[PDB]
């Protein structure tokens, strides 16, 4: 986050595994994996998208 130090806010970063309709609002994205990011507290947020797949490898 590259705003002024006087800026505050909370964001949600979501990863949804495939199969369903891609999330269109926060109500849906919140049902998958997600992290809440306090930009006023941390300038950087890190989310790990864990490996979840039917196959052992995904095509590039």
């Amino acid at each position: 986050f590259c705003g002024s130090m006087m800026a505050t806010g909370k964001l949600l970063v979501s990863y949804a595994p495939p199969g369903a309709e891609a999330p269109k609002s926060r109500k849906e994205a919140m049902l998958g994996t997600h992290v809440i990011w306090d930009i006023g507290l941390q300038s950087s947020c890190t989310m790990v998208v864990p490996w979840i797949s039917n196959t052992t490898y995904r095509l590039t």
Binding site: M6, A7, T8, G9, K10, L12, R26, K27, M30, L31, G32, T33, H34, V35, I36, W37, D38, G40, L41, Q42, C45
Partner: protein
Amino acid sequence: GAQVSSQKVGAHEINYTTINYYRDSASNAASKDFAQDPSKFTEPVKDMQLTLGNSTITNSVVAYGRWPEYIKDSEANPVDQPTEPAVAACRFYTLDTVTWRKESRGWWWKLPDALKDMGLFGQNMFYHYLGRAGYTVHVQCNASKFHQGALGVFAVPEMCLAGDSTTHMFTKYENANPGEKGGEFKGSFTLDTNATNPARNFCPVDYLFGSGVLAGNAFVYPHQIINLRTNNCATLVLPYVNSLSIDSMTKHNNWGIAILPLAPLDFATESSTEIPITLTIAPMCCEFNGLRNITVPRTQ
């Protein structure tokens, strides 16, 4: 089998004998600094990053100092196998964000009512006759260093709210269980006089805390203050509280969440200022019993 106990002598000029004559003990007579004697009643803190299921959150009270826990085999009333969804249901769900203005009188929600339409937790709740769960409630409200205002977040066991009519206990099921939208406190009591089509809704007066008690004493309940100059959020860890080890989640709401503006919101010199408040609730130690066809309660 005489019991010889000691008296506490006051005015001096020392043992008294008591014998129980009845088989039933109910027939017996009664036998009789900053440190808080009831440490558990003064909103003890969890003394970061809270991860539940696939959800993560980055000022935390444990209600009554009791962490959520599963039913002990010693205190299990039902005999059928308990369903424990685990990470499927025990995860953080984010309710609809509300708007805090200079004129807001407060907001309220019921648990487990507010999570009845939340993923697999709602499915398990409506598929089972009995359900039990604690909660982690995370209230989020951020504002600049030039904003001022304070919110009191209270977790009330058996949060019963007063009605709006001369008829006692007349609030209908639909209005008493609004879901994730919850309801709002009011600054005054307005009597519903529509005898033809009564609203049958609550009329929670803020300074009466919606139940005929002064709001100033609501701090006896588990609570946390979000003071905008100090902190952004508030975490409340609520254990399962009830007169039973497990009950019906559709019939009974175990907890109520109340957010009241203790200090009104204000900013610079803009009379038009509003900041969102976002609630994120994760049920904890969920367990359900009595699987059958799904319940579909009446709406509107």
